[PDB]
């Protein structure tokens, strides 16, 4: 997260870290047994870390659960990153508490201008690399489809939304993928891709999760 702020500890209790030795992607807890992330974050083995704040220090309040199942959207396409959504089944259920909590799926698609909260442990520089120990947070609005399409001509499917600032300076970044964009208590976006980070006229592009509510509920109720 470039241009954001350090989140208060456990202030984003649906945020998880996906770990394959080290942190590499985010995700969101949607029920006690399942995390939603981006499909390009697939790895054959994934450890889900819940209740995290400092991913580099054991606070004694975290939960460490390996993935038992990892299911990428069947139509995921690594080249246009359409259908960039993934479900991870925890090998044992998460214990829900004030620091480990679910986030609601969307009741409905999110309108342009809706203010959102994006979070993650990704790069905090738009040039160079500075990876935080502590979870970062950014408030940012949903952008209209036309402005999103205008920013990335011929690249934004109907399964993608832009959230951010066309003037630059504030965006998600590498290491934030799979992480949540939550607006009015609803997970509306999944960090997916962008041209660099926090560049002018190149906002973040996010999976439009409201298109996936049927796939999500149903994939869970089969695996």
């Amino acid at each position: 997260i470039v241009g954001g702020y350090t989140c208060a500890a456990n202030s984003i209790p649906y945020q998880v870290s996906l770990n394959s030795g080290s942190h590499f992607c985010g995700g969101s807890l949607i029920n006690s047994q399942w995390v939603v992330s981006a499909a390009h974050c697939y790895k054959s083995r994934i450890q889900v870390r819940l209740g995290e704040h400092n991913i580099d220090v054991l606070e004694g309040n975290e939960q460490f659960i390996n993935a038992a199942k990892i299911i990428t959207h069947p139509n995921f396409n690594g080249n246009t990153l359409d259908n960039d959504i993934m479900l991870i089944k925890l090998s044992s259920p998460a214990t829900l508490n004030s620091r480990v909590a679910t986030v609601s799926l969307p009741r409905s698609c999110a309108a342009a201008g809706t203010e959102c909260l994006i979070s993650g442990w990704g790069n905090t520089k738009s040039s160079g690399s500075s990876y935080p120990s502590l979870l970062q947070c950014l408030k940012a609005p949903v952008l209209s489809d036309s402005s999103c399409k205008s920013s990335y001509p011929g690249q934004i499917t109907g399964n993608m939304i832009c959230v951010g600032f066309l003037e630059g300076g504030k965006d998600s970044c590498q290491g934030d993928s799979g992480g949540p964009v939550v607006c009015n208590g609803q997970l509306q976006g999944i960090v997916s891709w962008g041209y660099g980070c926090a560049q002018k006229n190149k906002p973040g592009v996010y999976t439009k999760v409201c298109n996936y509510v049927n796939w999500i509920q149903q994939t869970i109720a089969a695996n």
């Binding site: 590499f24 390009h40 790069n123 160079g128 690399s129 970044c173 590498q174 993928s177 962008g194 660099g196």
Partner: peptide, 30 residues
């Protein structure tokens, strides 16, 4: 664009499509 996954790299082929291996050994946009 470049997907926003964190990948430690030695050279560009370690990276997803649209990314290159950055000067600090992380994948990112050219």
């Amino acid at each position: 664009g470049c997907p926003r996954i964190l990948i430690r790299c030695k050279q560009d082929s370690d990276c997803l499509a649209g990314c290159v291996c950055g000067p600090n050994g992380f994948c990112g946009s050219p």
